[PDB]
mmCIF file of C-alpha atoms (C1' of nucleotides) in Angstrom:
data_model
loop_
_atom_site.group_PDB
_atom_site.id
_atom_site.type_symbol
_atom_site.label_atom_id
_atom_site.label_comp_id
_atom_site.label_asym_id
_atom_site.label_seq_id
_atom_site.Cartn_x
_atom_site.Cartn_y
_atom_site.Cartn_z
ATOM 1 C CA UNK A 1 7.942 14.058 -16.323
ATOM 2 C CA UNK A 2 4.872 13.977 -18.571
ATOM 3 C CA UNK A 3 1.862 16.104 -19.508
ATOM 4 C CA UNK A 4 0.477 15.631 -15.973
ATOM 5 C CA UNK A 5 3.469 16.786 -13.920
ATOM 6 C CA UNK A 6 2.530 19.591 -11.530
ATOM 7 C CA UNK A 7 4.809 22.642 -11.699
ATOM 8 C CA UNK A 8 4.102 25.187 -8.966
ATOM 9 C CA UNK A 9 5.691 28.162 -10.736
ATOM 10 C CA UNK A 10 3.413 27.831 -13.771
ATOM 11 C CA UNK A 11 0.373 27.494 -11.502
ATOM 12 C CA UNK A 12 1.208 30.748 -9.705
ATOM 13 C CA UNK A 13 1.728 32.668 -12.961
ATOM 14 C CA UNK A 14 -1.496 31.345 -14.506
ATOM 15 C CA UNK A 15 0.153 29.361 -17.303
ATOM 16 C CA UNK A 16 -1.545 26.145 -16.100
ATOM 17 C CA UNK A 17 -5.150 26.630 -14.961
ATOM 18 C CA UNK A 18 -5.956 22.952 -14.389
ATOM 19 C CA UNK A 19 -7.695 22.328 -11.066
ATOM 20 C CA UNK A 20 -8.164 18.544 -10.760
ATOM 21 C CA UNK A 21 -5.353 16.566 -9.129
ATOM 22 C CA UNK A 22 -4.635 12.854 -8.737
ATOM 23 C CA UNK A 23 -3.391 11.902 -5.257
ATOM 24 C CA UNK A 24 -1.101 8.872 -5.385
ATOM 25 C CA UNK A 25 0.146 5.977 -3.246
ATOM 26 C CA UNK A 26 -2.714 6.071 -0.717
ATOM 27 C CA UNK A 27 -2.570 3.146 1.752
ATOM 28 C CA UNK A 28 -5.374 0.829 0.756
ATOM 29 C CA UNK A 29 -7.036 0.898 4.202
ATOM 30 C CA UNK A 30 -7.672 4.655 4.035
ATOM 31 C CA UNK A 31 -11.359 5.555 3.861
ATOM 32 C CA UNK A 32 -12.945 8.502 2.086
ATOM 33 C CA UNK A 33 -13.495 10.197 5.455
ATOM 34 C CA UNK A 34 -9.849 9.734 6.461
ATOM 35 C CA UNK A 35 -8.731 11.205 3.134
ATOM 36 C CA UNK A 36 -11.098 14.154 3.570
ATOM 37 C CA UNK A 37 -9.646 14.783 7.042
ATOM 38 C CA UNK A 38 -6.084 14.405 5.738
ATOM 39 C CA UNK A 39 -6.688 17.056 3.069
ATOM 40 C CA UNK A 40 -8.595 19.351 5.445
ATOM 41 C CA UNK A 41 -5.475 19.711 7.624
ATOM 42 C CA UNK A 42 -4.040 22.128 5.050
ATOM 43 C CA UNK A 43 -6.826 22.605 2.490
ATOM 44 C CA UNK A 44 -10.169 22.784 4.308
ATOM 45 C CA UNK A 45 -12.761 24.520 2.151
ATOM 46 C CA UNK A 46 -10.555 24.769 -0.956
ATOM 47 C CA UNK A 47 -11.930 21.867 -3.024
ATOM 48 C CA UNK A 48 -15.345 20.903 -4.370
ATOM 49 C CA UNK A 49 -14.905 17.292 -5.546
ATOM 50 C CA UNK A 50 -13.325 14.263 -3.893
ATOM 51 C CA UNK A 51 -13.352 10.631 -5.025
ATOM 52 C CA UNK A 52 -11.430 7.702 -3.537
ATOM 53 C CA UNK A 53 -12.541 4.490 -5.229
ATOM 54 C CA UNK A 54 -13.206 1.625 -2.801
ATOM 55 C CA UNK A 55 -12.989 -1.957 -4.060
ATOM 56 C CA UNK A 56 -15.900 -3.444 -2.116
ATOM 57 C CA UNK A 57 -14.778 -7.060 -2.652
ATOM 58 C CA UNK A 58 -11.548 -6.506 -0.744
ATOM 59 C CA UNK A 59 -11.380 -4.160 2.246
ATOM 60 C CA UNK A 60 -9.204 -1.781 0.251
ATOM 61 C CA UNK A 61 -9.186 1.348 -1.872
ATOM 62 C CA UNK A 62 -7.499 1.463 -5.281
ATOM 63 C CA UNK A 63 -4.526 3.430 -3.936
ATOM 64 C CA UNK A 64 -5.294 6.793 -5.561
ATOM 65 C CA UNK A 65 -7.863 9.580 -5.495
ATOM 66 C CA UNK A 66 -9.048 12.577 -7.503
ATOM 67 C CA UNK A 67 -9.743 16.037 -6.098
ATOM 68 C CA UNK A 68 -10.908 19.230 -7.791
ATOM 69 C CA UNK A 69 -9.590 22.404 -6.195
ATOM 70 C CA UNK A 70 -11.726 25.506 -6.584
ATOM 71 C CA UNK A 71 -8.683 27.633 -7.454
ATOM 72 C CA UNK A 72 -5.460 26.263 -8.990
ATOM 73 C CA UNK A 73 -3.335 28.042 -6.367
ATOM 74 C CA UNK A 74 -4.681 25.621 -3.745
ATOM 75 C CA UNK A 75 -2.632 22.893 -5.464
ATOM 76 C CA UNK A 76 0.551 24.685 -4.381
ATOM 77 C CA UNK A 77 -0.706 24.739 -0.785
ATOM 78 C CA UNK A 78 -1.490 21.017 -0.790
ATOM 79 C CA UNK A 79 1.565 19.966 -2.787
ATOM 80 C CA UNK A 80 4.131 21.947 -0.812
ATOM 81 C CA UNK A 81 2.764 20.570 2.479
ATOM 82 C CA UNK A 82 2.191 16.911 1.582
ATOM 83 C CA UNK A 83 4.327 15.870 -1.411
ATOM 84 C CA UNK A 84 7.269 13.747 -0.305
ATOM 85 C CA UNK A 85 5.791 13.014 3.134
ATOM 86 C CA UNK A 86 4.787 9.610 4.473
ATOM 87 C CA UNK A 87 1.140 8.575 4.434
ATOM 88 C CA UNK A 88 1.891 6.724 7.686
ATOM 89 C CA UNK A 89 4.647 7.863 10.048
ATOM 90 C CA UNK A 90 5.674 4.236 10.676
ATOM 91 C CA UNK A 91 6.213 3.222 7.031
ATOM 92 C CA UNK A 92 8.627 4.637 4.460
ATOM 93 C CA UNK A 93 6.926 2.774 1.602
ATOM 94 C CA UNK A 94 3.903 4.934 0.755
ATOM 95 C CA UNK A 95 4.810 8.558 -0.013
ATOM 96 C CA UNK A 96 2.243 11.193 -0.944
ATOM 97 C CA UNK A 97 2.603 12.422 -4.526
ATOM 98 C CA UNK A 98 0.383 14.315 -6.954
ATOM 99 C CA UNK A 99 -0.139 14.825 -10.666
ATOM 100 C CA UNK A 100 -2.770 16.399 -12.878
ATOM 101 C CA UNK A 101 -5.925 14.359 -13.405
ATOM 102 C CA UNK A 102 -7.025 13.233 -16.861
ATOM 103 C CA UNK A 103 -10.576 14.523 -16.245
ATOM 104 C CA UNK A 104 -10.528 18.256 -15.492
ATOM 105 C CA UNK A 105 -13.189 20.334 -13.777
ATOM 106 C CA UNK A 106 -16.081 19.909 -11.350
ATOM 107 C CA UNK A 107 -18.603 19.988 -14.210
ATOM 108 C CA UNK A 108 -16.806 17.212 -16.106
ATOM 109 C CA UNK A 109 -16.368 15.073 -12.983
ATOM 110 C CA UNK A 110 -20.071 15.442 -12.150
ATOM 111 C CA UNK A 111 -20.997 14.360 -15.680
ATOM 112 C CA UNK A 112 -18.578 11.428 -15.407
ATOM 113 C CA UNK A 113 -20.087 10.001 -12.226
ATOM 114 C CA UNK A 114 -23.729 11.144 -12.068
ATOM 115 C CA UNK A 115 -24.713 8.243 -14.362
ATOM 116 C CA UNK A 116 -22.128 5.839 -12.942
ATOM 117 C CA UNK A 117 -22.988 2.578 -11.205
ATOM 118 C CA UNK A 118 -20.901 3.567 -8.166
ATOM 119 C CA UNK A 119 -23.622 6.106 -7.248
ATOM 120 C CA UNK A 120 -25.773 3.201 -6.011
ATOM 121 C CA UNK A 121 -23.129 1.519 -3.887
ATOM 122 C CA UNK A 122 -22.841 2.642 -0.271
ATOM 123 C CA UNK A 123 -22.509 6.444 0.087
ATOM 124 C CA UNK A 124 -19.162 5.834 1.808
ATOM 125 C CA UNK A 125 -17.852 4.679 -1.596
ATOM 126 C CA UNK A 126 -19.400 7.477 -3.713
ATOM 127 C CA UNK A 127 -17.797 10.574 -5.210
ATOM 128 C CA UNK A 128 -18.613 13.709 -3.239
ATOM 129 C CA UNK A 129 -18.988 17.343 -4.262
ATOM 130 C CA UNK A 130 -18.938 20.453 -2.095
ATOM 131 C CA UNK A 131 -20.221 24.006 -2.422
ATOM 132 C CA UNK A 132 -17.795 25.974 -4.568
ATOM 133 C CA UNK A 133 -18.547 29.583 -3.560
ATOM 134 C CA UNK A 134 -20.361 31.691 -0.994
ATOM 135 C CA UNK A 135 -20.996 31.419 2.743
ATOM 136 C CA UNK A 136 -21.607 27.659 2.392
ATOM 137 C CA UNK A 137 -18.295 27.011 0.617
ATOM 138 C CA UNK A 138 -16.885 23.624 1.561
ATOM 139 C CA UNK A 139 -20.157 22.121 2.786
ATOM 140 C CA UNK A 140 -21.209 18.878 1.129
ATOM 141 C CA UNK A 141 -23.661 19.249 -1.828
ATOM 142 C CA UNK A 142 -26.110 16.583 -3.025
ATOM 143 C CA UNK A 143 -24.733 14.919 -6.127
ATOM 144 C CA UNK A 144 -26.896 15.665 -9.194
ATOM 145 C CA UNK A 145 -29.266 12.929 -10.304
ATOM 146 C CA UNK A 146 -28.599 10.766 -13.380
ATOM 147 C CA UNK A 147 -29.348 12.644 -16.600
ATOM 148 C CA UNK A 148 -29.242 9.850 -19.202
ATOM 149 C "C1'" U B 1 -5.467 8.043 -13.871
ATOM 150 C "C1'" U B 2 -11.576 7.587 -12.534
ATOM 151 C "C1'" C B 3 -15.610 3.866 -16.439
ATOM 152 C "C1'" U B 4 -23.263 0.325 -17.135
ATOM 153 C "C1'" G B 5 -16.781 -4.153 -20.802
ATOM 154 C "C1'" C B 6 -12.858 -1.362 -17.882
#
RNA sequence: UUCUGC
């Protein structure tokens, strides 16, 4: 229990309007595409930012990821379906868990990474954003250019 | 718990 614990009741009532979530304990061989597909099982079209950092030296990710949901209620959908479940049906070790992210909001996450050096590694390792509203909601958006 | 030290 800390300032980043996710409480569903206070999300539903509007007490906590944070939208960015840290996904924990990801097996290090997951790719960004696999994570996107994993989330889309229950939350397709409900988020507009996804980043799973890939350590290019190894063949592994850092074990966690950050996702910005468009509406806070979508956290309840993802959490109630995935929290406590195994990342791999053959291994009890890695269990999906969530908490609030320390950087909140699509705008802040864009500003964090648009000038970052990871934007010039392979696109498979880059943060991704998606259309937040309208008929194109959920489609991938070009990341804004560096502004520094 | 994200990083042009990270």
